[model samples]
Each structure stands twice: as structure tokens, then as C-alpha cells.
Target: MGKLKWFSGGKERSNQAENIITDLLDDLKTDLDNESLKKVLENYLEELKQKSASVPLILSRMNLDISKAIRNDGVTLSDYQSKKLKELTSISNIRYGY
Candidate 1:
């Protein structure tokens, strides 16, 4: 028989999440400041926790803890860094059907 399809479609979901997060981060980079970025990430994390009861897979996959990073870094993050966080929030919206 063909390889059994994994019950969880996390691979595709993670890929989609990754792309969306990347796009949003680029979009938000210049417009968002450190404080604003923190709020956005915090809100997204809260939404993920409340609705899905899970963390975004890409975060762990990429070895990132964005909110904590922002707190520790204490300055504006790079474009890609912010993009990743924005992507997370956007993915939550998509995944949760918001």
C-alpha cells in the first residue's frame, strides 16, 4: 500500500502558516515600532491560545519566541524578524477562520 497518510496535516498547515507570516512581516516592518510590534504579537498569541489552544507550529519550527525576544532585545527588530511575528498573527486569523 502507499505510505499511510499522516493523520495530522501539520506539514501543509505549517507551510501555509509560514508563507503568510513571511508576507505579513514584510508588510508591517516599517509601519510597526517595537512597542506596536509587541502588542500585535501579544494579541496574536492570545488569540492563538484562546481559539486554537495551541502555539503556531512555525514559531517552534524556526526556534523563535517572538514576544520574549522583543522584550529582551529592547530595540526594533529586523524586517524578517518582525515579518515572522506578523506572519504568526496572520496565520492565526487564517487557521481560526477569522
Candidate 2:
């Protein structure tokens, strides 16, 4: 039997999703409308939901909290989640103020 090749699919998808969030933050800033912000966040949250389905059991739980944080508030994406977006992108933390 051959050892299988494996990778963390969730992490890779997360990296891709963060790129999106970073671009949005750069493009939108305070100019982003509330409706647009929420829609974008929901799209990212959907990625998280997809991750939860594939990651390890413990990581999936954390992913659920992330989804709840965005969905329950429907106002601002939490700094924690935003930080994940910023970590690789080097973008500063930002919030909706308009």
C-alpha cells in the first residue's frame, strides 16, 4: 500500500478567501454600503461553512463560532475574523463607519 498524499484543504481555501476580503477592504473602506458589506461577509462566511464540513472536528467547532459571529451580528465582521483576513494580506484592520 502507498501512503496517501494529503493537504489541509480548509487552510488553502481560507488563504484564498482572505485574499478576497483584503481586496474588498481595500476597495470598499468606508465607502462600502451596509448591504454590500453584509453580502460580501456572507459570501466569506459561506466559505467558512464549507471549511467546517471538511476540517478536523475541533477546527470545525471554531469555524462554527466564526460563522455565528458574522451572522449573529449582521453589523461588523469581528476583528478576529478580519485579522485572519489581514494576516497574510498586510492590510490594516477596518470597520464600517458609514
Candidate 3:
């Protein structure tokens, strides 16, 4: 997916979210290949989780909790799915990460 921007009612995080997501997308899309993309995408998931861990307690925790479920359910989350999940959580994280 392209760079995903997040808006949280107000216009405060508009630029921050775009910058973060764009940077992530740029890094992810830099090296074009299946295997490498997979690997980098996996790394993106980790980076997302690690970063998300810093958001407000409830929301970020909720994100991590859901992601934890993916791990707990033995659902074999691919790098892309994992990245998507992380991005999902980041909507909250970026919103509140401030």
C-alpha cells in the first residue's frame, strides 16, 4: 500500500503521520523483490510494535494486545499482514504518540 496518513479529528498530527508512514513506505519499497520485501516487511512489523509500545497506555496496549493475538492464535501472520496490523495500531499510536 502507499503511504498511509492518519487524522484524529484535529489537524495536529496530519503532517507527523504522513512523514512517519511515508518514511516507512519509502524504506519498505526501496528494494524491490519478493523475498527481500518479505524480510523488510517483517522488520516493519517489529518496528511498528516497538514504536507503538510508546503510545498512550490504553490504545497502544490495545494494538499490542491484538497483535499479540495474532501470535497467540498461531495465525501465521505474513509480513504484509503483520505490517498492516502494526499500521492499524499506529493509527492510535500516531494519534496519541504526539
Cα lDDT, model 3, residue 20: 43
Question: Which segments of model 2 are wrong by more than 4 Å?
Answer: 1-13, 32-38, 42-98
Q: What does candidate 3's lDDT look like per residue over 1-98, in tens digits?
A: 34546443344433333234444455456544323333433443444445354333334544444455544544354465456545545556445542
Please list all clashing residue pairs in model 1, or write none if there are none.
21-87, 25-83
User: In model 1, which runs have C-alpha deviations exceeding 4 angstroms?
Assistant: 1-11, 35-58, 61-64, 73-98
**Residue-level lDDT tens digits of model 2 in 9-95:** 355644444444445444455654344544544454355446464323223333344456555557465455466544433322222
In the order shown, the candidates' Cα RMSDs to the true structure are 11.3, 14.4, 11.2
Model 2 score (lDDT)? 0.43
Q: Which model scores highest in TM-score?
A: 1
TM-score of each: 0.31, 0.27, 0.28
Cα lDDT, model 3, residue 90: 56
Pitting candidate 1 against candidate 3, the one with the higher TM-score is: 1
lDDT string, candidate 1, 1-98, tens digits? 13423232256554444344434445565664554554444444344334454456434423245545556757566767755545546544344422
